[PDB]
Amino acid sequence: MATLLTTDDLRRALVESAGETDGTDLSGDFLDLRFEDIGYDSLALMETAARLESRYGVSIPDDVAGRVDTPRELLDLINGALAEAA
Numbered sequence: 001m002a003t004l005l006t007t008d009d010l011r012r013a014l015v016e017s018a019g020e021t022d023g024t025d026l027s028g029d030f031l032d033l034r035f036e037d038i039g040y041d042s043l044a045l046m047e048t049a050a051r052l053e054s055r056y057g058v059s060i061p062d063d064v065a066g067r068v069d070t071p072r073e074l075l076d077l078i079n080g081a082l083a084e085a086a
Contacts, residue, residue, distance in 0.1 A: 005056070005078040007031070010071065013055070017048040031072050052078060057085060 001009070007029075015027050021039040024030075030038050035045055045068070049060050052074075058081035068074045 004082055005075055010075055010078070013052060014048060014071070017044050017051070031075070032070055034069050035071070036069070049074075056082065058082065 011027065011030070014030065018024075018026055018039055021044075024038045025033065026038050035042075040048075046065070049065055049068075052058060053060055056078060058078055060077055060081070064073070064077045068077065
């Protein structure tokens with residue numbers, strides 16, 4: 001911790017949204033798994049993204065919000081935003 005968003009950190013926020021839609025490997029290793037296959041609908045994705053902006057004090061660019069089919073892209077955005085944020 002104390003530097004960027006980690007696997008565990010992101011996992012928490014993700015599993016906070018996707019609940020009652022379990023059975024996937026969201027709690028574990030989801031980085032290269034598609035939101036589609038991990039039980040995420042685009043609507044729930046925006047919910048998560050918005051909460052991320054709120055909680056971590058980040059700002060997700062519109063172009064990035066629609067390129068994140070894999071949590072890897074999301075992770076990258078948050079890390080980029082954290083590094084940018086001072």
